Design a protein around this ligand. Structure first.
Ligand SMILES: [Cl-]
Ligand SMILES: [Cl-]
Ligand SMILES: [Cl-]
Length: 229
């Protein structure tokens, strides 16, 4: 059983995230549900106190294997199993700071566990990330291309809405690498439409978020694959 055969829904998730921003250390944990392909949630919470950054900015650090892929594009993230992959991210909040994340995953009993680290340095203490002045991030198309002999690269530019109704940009660039000592067939260049919706659980007493991601792959520009060898 491998690949898409291993991703029979419903499934669940867990996360453990160790972080630091501008010298402030913190941790997050969470559990989530994946009812069906492409719709995946996460209820996460800060276990060290209040989160020292925006929940909106931490949303992309908080599971591409749950994306919904049509049959005509390779689902690289799912094809990495068994064996797994790592994700390495850089998120530049333009005019403000840069963070990086590293993710490792394992799959057991229908649950994907993420163990992630986050490092963020140089942020403005009156910026929106540290003052928690974001409301949401807008939906976006992540561009996925073959990268090196055995990985992929994911790139996006994200619009973050502040409380005053204006936008800040985050430039995001990620590399995914199979860690399974085996060759995984690269997909053609394509796009991943992604939306994040966040809310609060009225009862939960912790600093937390309840997040859903909807992620659907498509060959949005059929000529694009020709540019990536
Ligand atoms: Cl927030
Ligand atoms: Cl990404
Ligand atoms: Cl493909």
């Amino acid at each position: 059983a491998s690949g898409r055969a291993l991703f029979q829904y419903p499934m669940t998730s867990k996360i453990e995230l160790n972080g630091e921003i501008n010298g402030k250390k913190f941790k997050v944990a969470g559990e989530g549900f994946t009812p069906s392909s492409g719709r995946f949630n996460m209820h996460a919470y800060c276990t060290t106190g209040d989160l020292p950054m925006s929940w909106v900015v931490i949303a992309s650090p908080l599971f591409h294997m749950f994306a919904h892929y049509p049959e005509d594009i390779t689902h690289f993230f799912q094809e990495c199993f068994p064996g797994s992959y790592t994700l390495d991210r850089t998120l530049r909040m333009e005019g403000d700071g840069t963070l990086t994340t590293h993710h490792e995953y394992s799959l057991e009993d229908g649950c994907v566990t993420s163990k992630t680290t986050l490092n963020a340095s140089g942020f403005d203490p009156k910026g929106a990330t540290m003052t928690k002045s974001f409301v949401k991030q807008l939906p976006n198309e992540v561009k996925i291309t073959p990268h090196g002999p055995n990985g992929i690269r994911l790139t996006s530019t994200v619009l973050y809405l502040k409380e005053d109704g204006t936008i800040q940009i985050g430039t995001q660039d990620c590399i995914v690498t199979p860690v399974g000592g085996r060759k995984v067939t690269q997909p053609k260049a394509h796009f991943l439409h992604t939306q994040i919706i966040q809310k609060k659980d009225p009862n939960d007493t912790r600093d937390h978020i309840v997040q859903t991601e909807l992620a659907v792959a498509g060959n949005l520009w059929h000529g694009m694959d020709e540019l990536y060898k």
